Amino acid sequence: DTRIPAGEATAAWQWEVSRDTGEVHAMLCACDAHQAAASGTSAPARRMETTEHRVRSGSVHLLRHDGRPAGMFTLTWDPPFAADEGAFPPAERPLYLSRLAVAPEWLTGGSLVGLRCLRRAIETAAQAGGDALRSEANPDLSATRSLLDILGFVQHGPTLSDGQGRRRVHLHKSL
């Protein structure tokens, strides 16, 4: 006797494979600006070419609320960063999480949109046959870093500085 909750409030949240490049890039840059202001850092330089490539490949999963984009992530089989791979535990079929973004209006309160996006990414990576979910994070973004730590993303290698004041870490979650 299974009871899945229906109702319009539940249906207000909809997941999709994104096909709108400008929407994805605007969401990403807005989240970048919010987190950079909140953490005293500078927002990273985002490439619209990368956005186009990820959207064209069907790698961008976007969560909408009443039609407006609330969160998203990018899930790929190929690494979007050049980590030593010794900075990760061994894995035979790793998937890679990148460009996690939550709309600034959902970065406060208790709607748990970031948790929704990370849960969606973990699930999707597991269903695609994934051995692990690897990601590159900014440890200076305290809230996202703590959410990744609570969800089981382990840092294996050392913290890296890019030479221009930006810190990054490589996280790995077993699936």
- Which residue type occupies 138? N
66: left (phi over 0), alpha (psi -120 to 50) or beta: left
Q: Report the alpha-carbon distance of residue 43 to residue 36 in Å, rounded.
A: 5
Angle between helices 48-56 and 21-39 (to 10 degrees): 130
Handedness of CA 119, 125, 130, 134 (dihedral sign): negative
**Is the Cβ–Cβ distance between 132 and 95 less than 8 Å?**
yes
**Is the Cβ–Cβ distance between 136 and 118 less than 8 Å?**
no
Name beta bridge partners: 71.
Answer: 63, 102
Q: What letter does residue 47 receive in the DSSP assignment?
A: -
**Is the Cβ–Cβ distance between 74 and 80 less than 8 Å?**
yes
Q: Report the alpha-carbon distance of residue 90 to residue 104 in Å, rounded.
A: 35
**Is the Cβ–Cβ distance between 166 and 132 less than 8 Å?**
no
Cα angle for residues 68, 72, 74 (degrees, 5° grid): 145
Q: Report the alpha-carbon distance of residue 21 to residue 18 in Å, rounded.
A: 8
Chain length of the chain: 175
Q: Report the alpha-carbon distance of residue 111 to residue 117 in Å, rounded.
A: 11
**Is the Cβ–Cβ distance between 174 and 152 less than 8 Å?**
yes
Q: What is the resolution of this structure in A?
A: 2.5
Q: Which residue has the tokens 């927002």?
A: 43
Which residue segments constitute the domains of the chain, with CATH numbers given?
A: 7-174 (3.40.630.30)
Alpha helices in 40-134 (DSSP H): 48-56, 113-127
Q: Report the alpha-carbon distance of residue 64 to residue 161 in Å, rounded.
A: 34
Q: Which residue has the tokens 């500085």?
A: 161
Dihedral pair phi/psi, residue 152, rounded to 5°:
100, 10
